[PDB]
Curated annotation (Swiss-Prot):
Span of the entire protein shown here: 314 to 370 of 709
Name of the protein in question: SH3 domain-containing kinase-binding protein 1
Residues covered by the SH3 domain: 8-64
Subunit structure: Can self-associate and form homotetramers. Interacts with CD2, F-actin capping protein, PIK3R3, GRB2, EGFR, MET, BLNK, MAP3K4, PDCD6IP, SPRY2, ARHGAP17, ARHGAP27, CRK, BCAR1, SOS1, ASAP1, ARAP3, HIP1R, SYNJ2, INPP5D and STAP1. Interacts with E3 ubiquitin-protein ligase CBL. Interacts with CBLB, but does not interact with CBLC. Two molecules of SH3KBP1 seem to bind through their respective SH3 1 domain to one molecule of CBLB. The interaction with CBL or CBLB and EGFR is increased upon EGF stimulation. The interaction with CBL is attenuated by PDCD6IP. Interacts (via SH3 domains) with ARAP1.
Organism: Mus musculus
Gene designation per UniProt: Sh3kbp1
Compartments reported by the entry: Cytoplasm; Cytoplasm, Cytoskeleton; Cytoplasmic vesicle membrane; Synapse, Synaptosome
Amino acid sequence: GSSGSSGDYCKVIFPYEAQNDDELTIKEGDIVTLINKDCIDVGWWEGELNGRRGVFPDNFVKLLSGPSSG
């Protein structure tokens, strides 16, 4: 089956508005590929969306365990 996971997919449920370039703009109903994790401190994370690279509030998003149906 599966050997290992390359990245981490996260489903966006809460709409956010990036204030600065650093911050990424995400809407409700979109998945963002987690690029790099945040420091021991939770609440921040970096992902790629629409060919962009910026930070975002983890709380706003969530970690997907795995696709069951489709």
